[PDB]
Amino acid sequence: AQRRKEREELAQQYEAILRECGHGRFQWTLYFVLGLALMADGVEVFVVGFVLPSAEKDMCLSDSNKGMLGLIVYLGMMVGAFLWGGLADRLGRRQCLLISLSVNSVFAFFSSFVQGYGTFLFCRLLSGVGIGGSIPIVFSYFSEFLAQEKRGEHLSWLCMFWMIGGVYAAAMAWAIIPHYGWSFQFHSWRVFVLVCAFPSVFAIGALTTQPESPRFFLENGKHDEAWMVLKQVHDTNMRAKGHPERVFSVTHIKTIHTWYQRWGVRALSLGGQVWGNFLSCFGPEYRRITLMMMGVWFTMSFSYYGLTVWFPDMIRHLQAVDGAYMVYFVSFLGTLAVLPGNIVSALLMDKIGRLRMLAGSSVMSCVSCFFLSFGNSESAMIALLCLFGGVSIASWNALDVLTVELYPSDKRTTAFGFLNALCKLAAVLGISIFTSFVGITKAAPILFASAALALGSSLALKLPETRGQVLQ
Ligand SMILES: Cc1cnccc1CN1C[C@@H](c2cc(F)c(F)c(F)c2)CC1=O
Structure with a gap:
């Protein structure tokens, strides 16, 4: 009971300090810096989903190898999400984000020069492992300054920035891969892979300049570092707004108080702490919340990734009844249609609340998925896909906000990483099942996705409201 009281007092004082610091130049600079990593994650997702399964350039593997090539990277993304989310609660958000981005950049760079299918598979798997940790770390890192x-x-x-990265990857694919003349053992897909690694390098370079989260310092006994970071934030914001004479008034902040053999014991202790943090998410205070979160994340991910592999095959069926450029253009349109949903969700999130956003977006996504069964031509299918994505992205945004706000700071990245790993697993399962339903029928995939979305909305209706409360 003592620890909960002390952490509530710390949360109240931290909210007061953040109100004193204000919102301004520092927050937007960090916003762009972390948007770079989100863009890198979007680029990775596009590459894995469209060009990675040897569309035309590679063609050095069997069809079974083509299917595995993507799913193993999704599994690596799941593993990396869990690992880096767990480690971010013990080592820090900035440290783990830097390490994960460095791993992703190094192995993405390596995959461009390899001359073998096995080495390419290994490098892309480890790149996925590195990149999987971006979203859970980035969202918590940015939330701890707001x-x-x-x-x-x-x-x-x-x-x-996830959409921006998707657009960047789509444009680079469109520009590079058809231009086979850029080959010099070397081909154009290697140039595309090399170019896709630039956003991660830029993200690392920018992130080197930003400070560690002061909330992590306060939760771990490092009062002075947190005070210095908060004073830096306050000074930057006040100098930007034209009041450099103002003085940071905060004095004291509530604080929650061979070599390889030592490496081994340290790793064992760190793994034990991460496992304890994971198990504490199913305790009596959070078990019901965690179970409801698992259902909403899983059903939304299962439906989206199931439809997005079912959709291109259905277009191919329509084209039979009626080029890589069309693939690039369709992927670009599908990722571009997200923008209005992002804008509207950002403008309405605090006005109407996270719960109403999630429920309405889930209902609209289910309705649009059911409408997908009425497709009769390529153009109508493209429009319906754009509509579905635009109406569905708002549920993902609301779910991000809820996951950020539903868990305390000492377990936030662990819970977020677990949920993101569950999402990657749901993506794998949905891709496998909807590919197993390639031509058997048409009603069944639509019905399955609509039922999953309805279940997700039903579970979302039961979540608690976190609006108007200090960040626990
Ligand atoms: C931002 C984010 C937050 N949490 C977990 C994962 C992510 C990244 N996303 C966005 C999701 C998405 C939803 C849509 F409806 C679309 F139309 C679309 F193109 C993409 C799927 C994904 O991988």
Whole structure:
């Protein structure tokens, strides 16, 4: 009972300090810096989903190897999400984000020069492992600098960079891969892979300049470092707004108080702490919340990734009844249609609340998925896919905000990483099942996705409201 009281007091004082610091130049600079990593994650997702399964350039593997090539990377993303989310609660958000981005960059760079299918598979798997940790770390890292007044809108604006990365990867694919003349053992897919690694390098370079989260310092006994970071934030914000004469008034902050053999014992202790943090998410205080979160994350991920592999095959069926450029253009349109949903969700998140956003978006996504069964031509299918994505992204934004706000700071990245790993597993399962339903029928995939979305909405209706409360 003592620890909960002390952490509530710390949360109240931290909210007061953030109100004193204000929102301004520092927050937007960090926003762009973390948006770079989100863009890197979007680029990785596009590459894995479209060009990675040897569309035309590689063609050095069997069809079974083509299917495995993507799913193993999704499994690596799941593993990396869990690992880096767990480690971020013990080592820090900035440290683990830097390590994961470095691993992703190194192995993405390595995969460009390898001359073998096995080595390419290994490098892409480890790149996925490195990149899987971005979202859970980034969202918590940015949330730990935001006051409660407009926290939801600021968190929702962060989702634009995933779409930006998808667009960047689509344009680079469109420009590079068809130009086979750029080959010099070397081909154009290697140039594309090399170019796709630039956003991660830029993210690392920018992130080197930003400080560690002061909330992590306060939760771990490092009062002075947190005070220095908060004073830096306050000074930057006040100098930007034209009041450099103002003095940071905070004095004291509530604080929650061979070599390889030592490496081994340290690793064992760290793994034990991570496992304890994971198991504490199923305790009596959080078990019901965690179970409801698992259902909403799983059903939404299962439906989206199931439809997005079913959709291109259905277009191919329509084209039979009626080029890589069409693939690039369709992927670009599908990722571009997300923008209005992101804008509207960012503008309405704090006005109407996370719960109403999630419920309405889930209902609209289910309705649009059911409407997908009425497709009769390529153009109508493209429009319906754009509509579905635009109406569905808002549920993902609201779920990000809820996951950020539903867990305490000492387990936030662990819970987020577990949920993101569950999402990657759901993506794997949905891709496998909807590929197993390639031509057997048409009603069944649509019905399955609609039922999953309805179950997700039903579970989302039962979540608690976190709006208007200090960040626990
Ligand atoms: C931002 C984010 C937050 N949490 C977990 C994962 C992510 C990244 N996303 C976005 C999701 C998405 C939803 C849509 F409806 C679309 F139309 C679309 F193109 C993409 C799927 C994914 O991988």
